[PDB]
């Protein structure tokens, strides 16, 4: 894969209860490093990872200002969208944005991203060529025309190919001790009798990073996909992740089941048994 940086913006209107609230979080791969909340008393971009704390006041002032500007811009956008869709000012609406870069082994941009969603639906996205847009509907085509005329794609391309990957490389080096270190899962199998006839085997993967992982049960070397309960990968709360997979087995057949774990932190794929 490739290392990445992403910013996630969320603005939500609240008619009758003031202006829309803007929230921003930034990630390097699966590690959050900054946050901003427009409802805060003194709205500031704040550190969220140890390796970003070293950045100077100029960094925090600049990014705080951009977030303040983005707060106002999103409020204009929300107003604008309401008009495009002929919606009243009574209902709450949501605007989301994700953007960022993937850096390649040469240290150059591997792929750039910049996409928007309105009320949970794809609205407009910058294509991989970073020079054109994909608009979801007629409303988004109005936005497209504005952004074409304003040469938005070019400006973003410049950011993505330069600033973005430059700072990403910086973060990766400053936080190398954690960001460029893969923590393999601590794994085990538990056994939970359901009756005299069956029991649950649950395969655990705990304390791993990054979040990407594969957990599978096999019986006699055959995949048990459609019989396995796979929970969504979840945060431990300490910057690492958790996941488990479970299968119901006939009593006395436990030995025929094997759990298989793939993760970039492992020397090699694991096979587990009860």
């Amino acid at each position: 894969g490739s290392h990445s940086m992403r910013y996630f913006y969320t603005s939500v209107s609240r008619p009758g209860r003031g202006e829309p609230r803007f929230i921003s979080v930034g990630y390097v791969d699966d590690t959050q490093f900054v946050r901003f909340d427009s409802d805060a008393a003194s709205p500031r971009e704040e550190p969220r990872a140890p390796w970003i704390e070293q950045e100077g006041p100029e960094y925090w002032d600049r990014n705080t200002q951009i977030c303040k500007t983005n707060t106002q811009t999103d409020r204009e956008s929300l107003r604008n969208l309401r008009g495009y869709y002929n919606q009243s000012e009574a209902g709450s609406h949501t605007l989301q944005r994700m953007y960022g870069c993937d850096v390649g082994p040469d240290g150059r941009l591997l792929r750039g991203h910049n996409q928007f969603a309105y009320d949970g639906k794809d609205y407009i996205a910058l294509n991989e060529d970073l020079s054109s847009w994909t608009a979801a509907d007629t409303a988004a085509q109005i936005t497209q025309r504005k952004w074409e005329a304003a040469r938005v794609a070019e400006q973003l391309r410049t950011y993505l190919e330069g600033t973005c990957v430059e700072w990403l490389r910086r973060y990766l080096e400053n936080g190398k001790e954690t960001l460029q270190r893969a923590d393999p899962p601590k794994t085990h199998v538990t056994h939970h009798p359901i009756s005299d006839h069956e029991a649950t085997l649950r395969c655990w993967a705990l304390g791993f990073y990054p979040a990407e992982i594969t957990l599978t049960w096999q019986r006699d070397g055959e995949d048990q996909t459609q019989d396995t309960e796979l929970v969504e990968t979840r945060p431990a709360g300490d910057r690492t992740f958790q996941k488990w997979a479970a299968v119901v087995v006939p009593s006395g057949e436990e030995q025929r089941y094997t759990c298989h774990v793939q993760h970039e932190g492992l020397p090699k794929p694991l096979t587990l048994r009860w």
Partner: protein
């Protein structure tokens, strides 16, 4: 245009009676973002609860982690109570240390 939250209740570290730990309630895959989440001890709301900063997944659905420090015992019961526009009433999910 609305998606109901998935809910997982679990501890940061493998549960051990009498050992300090963290109780988590992970809500995800929901939209819109407004959501009410409470951690409960024996049916009573826990006061000191913090949550993560609002973020979202590739499909645009939101996720949040609510968490609090706790020391599990044999008889004490914990749960997560969630309300969302998509729910006709608060949903309660009990903490099972085996899950």
């Amino acid at each position: 245009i609305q998606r109901t939250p998935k809910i997982q209740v679990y501890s940061r570290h493998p549960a051990e009676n009498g050992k300090s730990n963290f109780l988590n309630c992970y809500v995800s895959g929901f939209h819109p973002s407004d959501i009410e989440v409470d951690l409960l001890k024996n049916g009573e709301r826990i006061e000191k609860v913090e949550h993560s900063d609002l973020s979202f997944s590739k499909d645009w659905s939101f996720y949040l982690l609510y968490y609090t420090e706790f020391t599990p015992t044999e008889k004490d019961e914990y749960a997560c109570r969630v309300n969302h526009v998509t729910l006709s009433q608060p949903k309660i999910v009990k903490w099972d240390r085996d899950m």
